PDB file of C-alpha atoms and ligand atoms in Angstrom:
ATOM      1  CA  UNK A   7      63.114 173.982  85.275  1.00  0.00           C
ATOM      2  CA  UNK A   8      66.547 175.426  86.735  1.00  0.00           C
ATOM      3  CA  UNK A   9      67.028 176.108  90.156  1.00  0.00           C
ATOM      4  CA  UNK A  10      70.311 177.425  91.764  1.00  0.00           C
ATOM      5  CA  UNK A  11      72.769 174.907  92.655  1.00  0.00           C
ATOM      6  CA  UNK A  12      74.488 174.546  96.126  1.00  0.00           C
ATOM      7  CA  UNK A  13      77.317 176.810  95.671  1.00  0.00           C
ATOM      8  CA  UNK A  14      75.071 179.599  94.643  1.00  0.00           C
ATOM      9  CA  UNK A  15      72.544 179.028  97.693  1.00  0.00           C
ATOM     10  CA  UNK A  16      75.438 178.496 100.185  1.00  0.00           C
ATOM     11  CA  UNK A  17      77.074 181.782  99.252  1.00  0.00           C
ATOM     12  CA  UNK A  18      73.715 184.016  99.335  1.00  0.00           C
ATOM     13  CA  UNK A  19      74.879 186.944 101.359  1.00  0.00           C
ATOM     14  CA  UNK A  20      78.605 186.558 101.162  1.00  0.00           C
ATOM     15  CA  UNK A  21      81.532 187.921  99.155  1.00  0.00           C
ATOM     16  CA  UNK A  22      85.119 187.425  98.059  1.00  0.00           C
ATOM     17  CA  UNK A  23      88.335 189.158  97.433  1.00  0.00           C
ATOM     18  CA  UNK A  24      88.195 190.475  93.746  1.00  0.00           C
ATOM     19  CA  UNK A  25      91.677 189.296  92.854  1.00  0.00           C
ATOM     20  CA  UNK A  26      92.488 185.953  94.984  1.00  0.00           C
ATOM     21  CA  UNK A  27      88.788 184.796  95.649  1.00  0.00           C
ATOM     22  CA  UNK A  28      89.018 184.271  99.358  1.00  0.00           C
ATOM     23  CA  UNK A  29      87.081 184.984 102.038  1.00  0.00           C
ATOM     24  CA  UNK A  30      87.295 184.873 105.940  1.00  0.00           C
ATOM     25  CA  UNK A  31      86.012 181.563 106.933  1.00  0.00           C
ATOM     26  CA  UNK A  32      82.287 182.446 107.740  1.00  0.00           C
ATOM     27  CA  UNK A  33      82.075 180.214 110.953  1.00  0.00           C
ATOM     28  CA  UNK A  34      78.304 182.086 111.821  1.00  0.00           C
ATOM     29  CA  UNK A  35      77.277 180.015 108.793  1.00  0.00           C
ATOM     30  CA  UNK A  36      77.735 176.654 109.746  1.00  0.00           C
ATOM     31  CA  UNK A  37      74.796 175.090 111.530  1.00  0.00           C
ATOM     32  CA  UNK A  38      74.376 172.481 114.284  1.00  0.00           C
ATOM     33  CA  UNK A  39      73.285 170.201 111.360  1.00  0.00           C
ATOM     34  CA  UNK A  40      76.715 171.097 109.986  1.00  0.00           C
ATOM     35  CA  UNK A  41      79.069 170.138 112.552  1.00  0.00           C
ATOM     36  CA  UNK A  42      76.971 166.593 112.870  1.00  0.00           C
ATOM     37  CA  UNK A  43      77.659 166.020 109.259  1.00  0.00           C
ATOM     38  CA  UNK A  44      81.271 167.077 109.353  1.00  0.00           C
ATOM     39  CA  UNK A  45      81.469 164.647 112.611  1.00  0.00           C
ATOM     40  CA  UNK A  46      79.323 161.865 110.843  1.00  0.00           C
ATOM     41  CA  UNK A  47      81.710 162.079 107.685  1.00  0.00           C
ATOM     42  CA  UNK A  48      84.882 162.305 109.915  1.00  0.00           C
ATOM     43  CA  UNK A  49      83.750 158.974 111.908  1.00  0.00           C
ATOM     44  CA  UNK A  50      82.995 157.323 108.975  1.00  0.00           C
ATOM     45  CA  UNK A  51      86.067 157.673 107.233  1.00  0.00           C
ATOM     46  CA  UNK A  52      88.170 156.859 110.182  1.00  0.00           C
ATOM     47  CA  UNK A  53      86.435 153.957 110.726  1.00  0.00           C
ATOM     48  CA  UNK A  54      87.067 152.908 106.992  1.00  0.00           C
ATOM     49  CA  UNK A  55      90.779 153.976 106.145  1.00  0.00           C
ATOM     50  CA  UNK A  56      92.976 152.342 108.358  1.00  0.00           C
ATOM     51  CA  UNK A  57      95.174 150.044 106.457  1.00  0.00           C
ATOM     52  CA  UNK A  58      93.773 151.599 103.402  1.00  0.00           C
ATOM     53  CA  UNK A  59      95.184 155.331 103.794  1.00  0.00           C
ATOM     54  CA  UNK A  60      98.843 155.855 103.741  1.00  0.00           C
ATOM     55  CA  UNK A  61     100.048 156.284 107.097  1.00  0.00           C
ATOM     56  CA  UNK A  62     101.273 159.967 106.274  1.00  0.00           C
ATOM     57  CA  UNK A  63      97.443 161.146 105.683  1.00  0.00           C
ATOM     58  CA  UNK A  64      96.296 159.411 108.834  1.00  0.00           C
ATOM     59  CA  UNK A  65      99.015 161.296 110.855  1.00  0.00           C
ATOM     60  CA  UNK A  66      98.281 164.623 109.492  1.00  0.00           C
ATOM     61  CA  UNK A  67      95.040 164.478 110.680  1.00  0.00           C
ATOM     62  CA  UNK A  68      96.223 164.039 114.345  1.00  0.00           C
ATOM     63  CA  UNK A  69      99.341 166.709 113.737  1.00  0.00           C
ATOM     64  CA  UNK A  70      96.887 169.310 112.793  1.00  0.00           C
ATOM     65  CA  UNK A  71      94.414 168.591 114.806  1.00  0.00           C
ATOM     66  CA  UNK A  72      91.515 168.268 112.730  1.00  0.00           C
ATOM     67  CA  UNK A  73      88.073 168.597 114.605  1.00  0.00           C
ATOM     68  CA  UNK A  74      86.153 165.485 115.172  1.00  0.00           C
ATOM     69  CA  UNK A  75      83.268 166.883 116.235  1.00  0.00           C
ATOM     70  CA  UNK A  76      82.717 170.234 114.226  1.00  0.00           C
ATOM     71  CA  UNK A  77      83.604 171.768 110.598  1.00  0.00           C
ATOM     72  CA  UNK A  78      87.200 173.250 111.875  1.00  0.00           C
ATOM     73  CA  UNK A  79      88.433 176.473 112.332  1.00  0.00           C
ATOM     74  CA  UNK A  80      90.778 177.537 109.466  1.00  0.00           C
ATOM     75  CA  UNK A  81      92.768 180.114 111.410  1.00  0.00           C
ATOM     76  CA  UNK A  82      93.426 177.249 114.362  1.00  0.00           C
ATOM     77  CA  UNK A  83      94.398 174.734 111.868  1.00  0.00           C
ATOM     78  CA  UNK A  84      96.801 177.244 109.913  1.00  0.00           C
ATOM     79  CA  UNK A  85      98.770 177.673 113.257  1.00  0.00           C
ATOM     80  CA  UNK A  86      99.818 173.822 113.019  1.00  0.00           C
ATOM     81  CA  UNK A  87     100.330 174.173 109.376  1.00  0.00           C
ATOM     82  CA  UNK A  88     102.288 177.050 108.905  1.00  0.00           C
ATOM     83  CA  UNK A  89     104.657 176.052 111.553  1.00  0.00           C
ATOM     84  CA  UNK A  90     104.935 172.578 109.671  1.00  0.00           C
ATOM     85  CA  UNK A  91     105.587 173.772 106.402  1.00  0.00           C
ATOM     86  CA  UNK A  92     104.780 177.245 105.952  1.00  0.00           C
ATOM     87  CA  UNK A  93     101.459 176.661 104.312  1.00  0.00           C
ATOM     88  CA  UNK A  94      98.255 177.825 105.089  1.00  0.00           C
ATOM     89  CA  UNK A  95      94.754 177.213 103.881  1.00  0.00           C
ATOM     90  CA  UNK A  96      92.249 179.779 102.455  1.00  0.00           C
ATOM     91  CA  UNK A  97      88.618 179.971 102.079  1.00  0.00           C
ATOM     92  CA  UNK A  98      87.152 179.976  98.969  1.00  0.00           C
ATOM     93  CA  UNK A  99      83.397 180.052  97.946  1.00  0.00           C
ATOM     94  CA  UNK A 100      83.706 176.878  95.536  1.00  0.00           C
ATOM     95  CA  UNK A 101      84.993 176.920  92.287  1.00  0.00           C
ATOM     96  CA  UNK A 102      87.775 179.447  91.447  1.00  0.00           C
ATOM     97  CA  UNK A 103      89.680 180.349  88.068  1.00  0.00           C
ATOM     98  CA  UNK A 104      92.418 178.061  87.520  1.00  0.00           C
ATOM     99  CA  UNK A 105      95.124 181.126  87.121  1.00  0.00           C
ATOM    100  CA  UNK A 106      94.020 181.881  91.005  1.00  0.00           C
ATOM    101  CA  UNK A 107      94.043 178.110  92.261  1.00  0.00           C
ATOM    102  CA  UNK A 108      97.665 177.873  90.328  1.00  0.00           C
ATOM    103  CA  UNK A 109      98.669 181.477  91.816  1.00  0.00           C
ATOM    104  CA  UNK A 110      97.649 180.221  95.589  1.00  0.00           C
ATOM    105  CA  UNK A 111      99.266 176.558  95.062  1.00  0.00           C
ATOM    106  CA  UNK A 112     102.583 178.720  94.070  1.00  0.00           C
ATOM    107  CA  UNK A 113     102.519 180.704  97.259  1.00  0.00           C
ATOM    108  CA  UNK A 114     101.818 177.879  99.375  1.00  0.00           C
ATOM    109  CA  UNK A 115      97.975 178.776  99.978  1.00  0.00           C
ATOM    110  CA  UNK A 116      95.547 175.636  99.684  1.00  0.00           C
ATOM    111  CA  UNK A 117      91.965 176.633  98.640  1.00  0.00           C
ATOM    112  CA  UNK A 118      89.031 175.331 100.394  1.00  0.00           C
ATOM    113  CA  UNK A 119      85.652 175.634  99.630  1.00  0.00           C
ATOM    114  CA  UNK A 120      84.072 176.632 103.110  1.00  0.00           C
ATOM    115  CA  UNK A 121      80.681 175.073 102.925  1.00  0.00           C
ATOM    116  CA  UNK A 122      79.453 171.724 103.746  1.00  0.00           C
ATOM    117  CA  UNK A 123      77.137 169.153 101.936  1.00  0.00           C
ATOM    118  CA  UNK A 124      73.600 168.526 103.363  1.00  0.00           C
ATOM    119  CA  UNK A 125      73.257 165.462 105.528  1.00  0.00           C
ATOM    120  CA  UNK A 126      70.912 163.971 102.916  1.00  0.00           C
ATOM    121  CA  UNK A 127      74.101 163.875 100.938  1.00  0.00           C
ATOM    122  CA  UNK A 128      76.288 162.710 103.188  1.00  0.00           C
ATOM    123  CA  UNK A 129      77.044 159.625 100.723  1.00  0.00           C
ATOM    124  CA  UNK A 130      78.496 161.491  98.005  1.00  0.00           C
ATOM    125  CA  UNK A 131      78.433 165.289  96.584  1.00  0.00           C
ATOM    126  CA  UNK A 132      79.985 165.855  93.150  1.00  0.00           C
ATOM    127  CA  UNK A 133      80.847 169.265  93.997  1.00  0.00           C
ATOM    128  CA  UNK A 134      83.874 169.753  96.208  1.00  0.00           C
ATOM    129  CA  UNK A 135      82.877 170.441  99.647  1.00  0.00           C
ATOM    130  CA  UNK A 136      84.537 171.313 103.189  1.00  0.00           C
ATOM    131  CA  UNK A 137      85.072 167.667 104.030  1.00  0.00           C
ATOM    132  CA  UNK A 138      86.414 166.637 100.826  1.00  0.00           C
ATOM    133  CA  UNK A 139      88.986 169.618 100.639  1.00  0.00           C
ATOM    134  CA  UNK A 140      89.860 169.695 104.247  1.00  0.00           C
ATOM    135  CA  UNK A 141      89.878 166.320 105.209  1.00  0.00           C
ATOM    136  CA  UNK A 142      90.744 164.886 102.050  1.00  0.00           C
ATOM    137  CA  UNK A 143      93.349 167.406 100.655  1.00  0.00           C
ATOM    138  CA  UNK A 144      95.024 169.164 103.621  1.00  0.00           C
ATOM    139  CA  UNK A 145      96.410 166.340 106.047  1.00  0.00           C
ATOM    140  CA  UNK A 146      99.435 165.846 103.725  1.00  0.00           C
ATOM    141  CA  UNK A 147     100.290 169.480 103.456  1.00  0.00           C
ATOM    142  CA  UNK A 148     102.286 168.690 106.706  1.00  0.00           C
ATOM    143  CA  UNK A 149     104.752 166.341 104.635  1.00  0.00           C
ATOM    144  CA  UNK A 150     107.335 168.689 103.682  1.00  0.00           C
ATOM    145  CA  UNK A 151     107.928 166.811 100.206  1.00  0.00           C
ATOM    146  CA  UNK A 152     104.246 166.354  99.171  1.00  0.00           C
ATOM    147  CA  UNK A 153     103.777 170.283  99.946  1.00  0.00           C
ATOM    148  CA  UNK A 154     106.829 171.128  98.065  1.00  0.00           C
ATOM    149  CA  UNK A 155     105.350 168.927  94.999  1.00  0.00           C
ATOM    150  CA  UNK A 156     101.977 170.653  95.382  1.00  0.00           C
ATOM    151  CA  UNK A 157     103.995 174.369  95.162  1.00  0.00           C
ATOM    152  CA  UNK A 158     106.248 173.217  92.074  1.00  0.00           C
ATOM    153  CA  UNK A 159     102.628 172.330  90.705  1.00  0.00           C
ATOM    154  CA  UNK A 160     101.328 175.772  91.487  1.00  0.00           C
ATOM    155  CA  UNK A 161     103.987 177.339  89.810  1.00  0.00           C
ATOM    156  CA  UNK A 162     103.468 175.592  86.882  1.00  0.00           C
ATOM    157  CA  UNK A 163     100.521 176.948  86.240  1.00  0.00           C
ATOM    158  CA  UNK A 164     101.887 180.401  84.366  1.00  0.00           C
ATOM    159  CA  UNK A 165     103.759 178.359  81.653  1.00  0.00           C
ATOM    160  CA  UNK A 166     100.832 176.049  81.362  1.00  0.00           C
ATOM    161  CA  UNK A 167      98.400 179.042  80.834  1.00  0.00           C
ATOM    162  CA  UNK A 168     100.541 180.430  78.437  1.00  0.00           C
ATOM    163  CA  UNK A 169     100.671 177.162  76.252  1.00  0.00           C
ATOM    164  CA  UNK A 170      97.239 176.498  76.571  1.00  0.00           C
ATOM    165  CA  UNK A 171      97.910 173.283  78.486  1.00  0.00           C
ATOM    166  CA  UNK A 172      96.176 173.863  81.734  1.00  0.00           C
ATOM    167  CA  UNK A 173      94.077 170.372  80.767  1.00  0.00           C
ATOM    168  CA  UNK A 174      97.581 168.801  80.809  1.00  0.00           C
ATOM    169  CA  UNK A 175      98.808 169.845  84.313  1.00  0.00           C
ATOM    170  CA  UNK A 176      95.035 168.912  85.279  1.00  0.00           C
ATOM    171  CA  UNK A 177      95.228 165.233  84.584  1.00  0.00           C
ATOM    172  CA  UNK A 178      98.200 165.349  86.762  1.00  0.00           C
ATOM    173  CA  UNK A 179      96.303 166.735  89.794  1.00  0.00           C
ATOM    174  CA  UNK A 180      93.510 164.298  89.254  1.00  0.00           C
ATOM    175  CA  UNK A 181      95.925 161.347  88.683  1.00  0.00           C
ATOM    176  CA  UNK A 182      97.999 162.287  91.903  1.00  0.00           C
ATOM    177  CA  UNK A 183      96.536 164.695  94.212  1.00  0.00           C
ATOM    178  CA  UNK A 184      92.981 163.392  93.973  1.00  0.00           C
ATOM    179  CA  UNK A 185      92.999 159.745  92.612  1.00  0.00           C
ATOM    180  CA  UNK A 186      97.002 158.767  93.270  1.00  0.00           C
ATOM    181  CA  UNK A 187      97.794 155.702  95.182  1.00  0.00           C
ATOM    182  CA  UNK A 188     101.040 154.650  96.843  1.00  0.00           C
ATOM    183  CA  UNK A 189     102.712 151.174  97.216  1.00  0.00           C
ATOM    184  CA  UNK A 190     104.443 150.225 100.564  1.00  0.00           C
ATOM    185  CA  UNK A 191     106.232 147.424 102.008  1.00  0.00           C
ATOM    186  CA  UNK A 192     102.732 146.819 103.832  1.00  0.00           C
ATOM    187  CA  UNK A 193     100.971 146.604 100.528  1.00  0.00           C
ATOM    188  CA  UNK A 194      99.177 149.425  98.189  1.00  0.00           C
ATOM    189  CA  UNK A 195      97.793 152.711 100.149  1.00  0.00           C
ATOM    190  CA  UNK A 196      95.791 155.531  99.432  1.00  0.00           C
ATOM    191  CA  UNK A 197      96.917 159.235  98.872  1.00  0.00           C
ATOM    192  CA  UNK A 198      94.308 160.644  96.780  1.00  0.00           C
ATOM    193  CA  UNK A 199      92.104 163.263  98.291  1.00  0.00           C
ATOM    194  CA  UNK A 200      89.059 162.247  95.914  1.00  0.00           C
ATOM    195  CA  UNK A 201      89.573 158.575  97.716  1.00  0.00           C
ATOM    196  CA  UNK A 202      90.178 159.400 101.179  1.00  0.00           C
ATOM    197  CA  UNK A 203      87.045 161.353 101.532  1.00  0.00           C
ATOM    198  CA  UNK A 204      84.922 158.848  99.511  1.00  0.00           C
ATOM    199  CA  UNK A 205      82.661 156.591 101.183  1.00  0.00           C
ATOM    200  CA  UNK A 206      83.295 153.575  98.812  1.00  0.00           C
ATOM    201  CA  UNK A 207      85.758 154.064  96.430  1.00  0.00           C
ATOM    202  CA  UNK A 208      88.706 153.215  98.877  1.00  0.00           C
ATOM    203  CA  UNK A 209      87.159 149.774  99.039  1.00  0.00           C
ATOM    204  CA  UNK A 210      87.016 149.504  95.212  1.00  0.00           C
ATOM    205  CA  UNK A 211      90.741 151.093  94.565  1.00  0.00           C
ATOM    206  CA  UNK A 212      92.508 148.564  96.997  1.00  0.00           C
ATOM    207  CA  UNK A 213      89.936 145.471  96.836  1.00  0.00           C
ATOM    208  CA  UNK A 214      88.714 145.376  93.206  1.00  0.00           C
ATOM    209  CA  UNK A 215      90.173 143.413  90.169  1.00  0.00           C
ATOM    210  CA  UNK A 216      88.424 145.487  88.147  1.00  0.00           C
ATOM    211  CA  UNK A 217      90.586 148.998  87.889  1.00  0.00           C
ATOM    212  CA  UNK A 218      94.366 149.217  86.493  1.00  0.00           C
ATOM    213  CA  UNK A 219      96.673 150.338  88.629  1.00  0.00           C
ATOM    214  CA  UNK A 220      99.532 151.324  86.657  1.00  0.00           C
ATOM    215  CA  UNK A 221     103.236 152.994  87.563  1.00  0.00           C
ATOM    216  CA  UNK A 222     103.617 156.377  87.466  1.00  0.00           C
ATOM    217  CA  UNK A 223     104.706 157.902  84.361  1.00  0.00           C
ATOM    218  CA  UNK A 224     104.439 161.861  83.899  1.00  0.00           C
ATOM    219  CA  UNK A 225     104.106 162.069  80.545  1.00  0.00           C
ATOM    220  CA  UNK A 226     101.420 158.660  80.094  1.00  0.00           C
ATOM    221  CA  UNK A 227      98.952 160.742  82.913  1.00  0.00           C
ATOM    222  CA  UNK A 228      99.586 164.073  80.977  1.00  0.00           C
ATOM    223  CA  UNK A 229      98.266 162.266  77.838  1.00  0.00           C
ATOM    224  CA  UNK A 230      95.292 160.419  80.154  1.00  0.00           C
ATOM    225  CA  UNK A 231      91.406 161.215  80.219  1.00  0.00           C
ATOM    226  CA  UNK A 232      89.361 161.481  83.436  1.00  0.00           C
ATOM    227  CA  UNK A 233      85.958 161.312  84.110  1.00  0.00           C
ATOM    228  CA  UNK A 234      84.658 162.839  87.147  1.00  0.00           C
ATOM    229  CA  UNK A 235      81.231 161.013  87.677  1.00  0.00           C
ATOM    230  CA  UNK A 236      82.736 157.207  88.165  1.00  0.00           C
ATOM    231  CA  UNK A 237      85.158 155.429  89.990  1.00  0.00           C
ATOM    232  CA  UNK A 238      88.555 155.646  88.279  1.00  0.00           C
ATOM    233  CA  UNK A 239      89.310 152.791  85.754  1.00  0.00           C
ATOM    234  CA  UNK A 240      92.823 153.721  86.240  1.00  0.00           C
ATOM    235  CA  UNK A 241      94.768 154.448  89.496  1.00  0.00           C
ATOM    236  CA  UNK A 242      98.618 155.762  88.813  1.00  0.00           C
ATOM    237  CA  UNK A 243     100.872 153.826  91.684  1.00  0.00           C
ATOM    238  CA  UNK A 244     103.849 156.153  93.019  1.00  0.00           C
ATOM    239  CA  UNK A 245     106.825 154.810  95.263  1.00  0.00           C
ATOM    240  CA  UNK A 246     107.317 157.693  97.198  1.00  0.00           C
ATOM    241  CA  UNK A 247     106.250 161.622  97.200  1.00  0.00           C
ATOM    242  CA  UNK A 248     109.832 162.178  96.579  1.00  0.00           C
ATOM    243  CA  UNK A 249     108.757 160.840  93.076  1.00  0.00           C
ATOM    244  CA  UNK A 250     105.798 163.351  92.411  1.00  0.00           C
ATOM    245  CA  UNK A 251     107.957 166.189  93.436  1.00  0.00           C
ATOM    246  CA  UNK A 252     111.238 165.208  91.368  1.00  0.00           C
ATOM    247  CA  UNK A 253     108.806 164.869  88.254  1.00  0.00           C
ATOM    248  CA  UNK A 254     108.213 168.935  88.224  1.00  0.00           C
ATOM    249  CA  UNK A 255     112.084 169.070  87.814  1.00  0.00           C
ATOM    250  CA  UNK A 256     112.239 168.987  84.221  1.00  0.00           C
ATOM    251  CA  UNK A 257     110.603 171.790  81.694  1.00  0.00           C
ATOM    252  CA  UNK A 258     107.398 170.973  80.813  1.00  0.00           C
ATOM    253  CA  UNK A 259     106.730 173.530  77.814  1.00  0.00           C
ATOM    254  CA  UNK A 260     108.263 170.572  75.220  1.00  0.00           C
ATOM    255  CA  UNK A 261     106.203 168.070  77.070  1.00  0.00           C
ATOM    256  CA  UNK A 262     103.246 170.048  76.486  1.00  0.00           C
ATOM    257  CA  UNK A 263     103.803 170.432  72.588  1.00  0.00           C
ATOM    258  CA  UNK A 264     104.583 166.736  72.390  1.00  0.00           C
ATOM    259  CA  UNK A 265     101.039 165.927  73.934  1.00  0.00           C
ATOM    260  CA  UNK A 266      99.097 168.650  71.837  1.00  0.00           C
ATOM    261  CA  UNK A 267      99.422 166.564  68.757  1.00  0.00           C
ATOM    262  CA  UNK A 268      98.848 163.540  70.303  1.00  0.00           C
ATOM    263  CA  UNK A 269      95.654 161.119  70.488  1.00  0.00           C
ATOM    264  CA  UNK A 270      95.015 161.098  74.563  1.00  0.00           C
ATOM    265  CA  UNK A 271      94.671 157.924  76.364  1.00  0.00           C
ATOM    266  CA  UNK A 272      91.168 157.013  77.579  1.00  0.00           C
ATOM    267  CA  UNK A 273      90.167 156.297  81.203  1.00  0.00           C
ATOM    268  CA  UNK A 274      90.295 152.969  81.172  1.00  0.00           C
ATOM    269  CA  UNK A 275      92.998 152.024  78.570  1.00  0.00           C
ATOM    270  CA  UNK A 276      96.385 150.516  79.235  1.00  0.00           C
ATOM    271  CA  UNK A 277      99.377 151.726  77.275  1.00  0.00           C
ATOM    272  CA  UNK A 278     101.616 149.453  75.595  1.00  0.00           C
ATOM    273  CA  UNK A 279     104.449 150.765  77.959  1.00  0.00           C
ATOM    274  CA  UNK A 280     102.805 150.724  81.145  1.00  0.00           C
ATOM    275  CA  UNK A 281     104.206 149.118  84.009  1.00  0.00           C
ATOM    276  CA  UNK A 282     101.115 147.225  85.260  1.00  0.00           C
ATOM    277  CA  UNK A 283     100.490 146.277  89.059  1.00  0.00           C
TER     278      UNK A 283
HETATM  279 CO1   CO B   1      89.884 167.478  95.231  1.00  0.00          CO
END
């Protein structure tokens, strides 16, 4: 039997803008259970993440006043975010078209799935939900260097789509924004949103001998496959958010055409020129 997925179930009776796929955050659809599930996830992650999350992430939660006890009001968070970096979050039903996603980031709008997992899925949800996309992705948007990286990333969507290279950018996003690590003199820390919202990946990614930790390299990353249904076999490590922003400076067009005919690295591969940490 095929049954409707969570995105479909949650958006029953709702709509979205035809062009940008946004809707006003539907605050009336959040139940008591939703606020309680949010509070449980927030409390869980805030216990796990000290000494694991990069300091900027934890500071961003505080500066944006991300609610600990309820699903945040996007408009209220935006007052803080706009003043900091001119960014805002916009509500979306779930997955949106790539060109729209990129156009959002290019215009300093960060799309956030509005709905939350059910408490029976506290441990993990495959689909991005509002906990992953707000708690995991948004706090670093008050960092002007990271925000500028996302903007530059967004702006690259037009050229990438024109050249059939959106999957090459998707790899860059995955291995930075979603699953990136940042080395510090205090030790390795986490900036990837997919790790920051996870129950257990933040333990594995710093404590396990199993995954590879490889220095950031743009071409390597854009030539590396990923999988969505398992902990990462490889994490890419930056020294600074400036490294990400600066990586967007050159013309990606000739990089895409070179990659197009190449065989990609497997998710668990170490490449001959990797700086292995
Ligand atoms: Co994400």
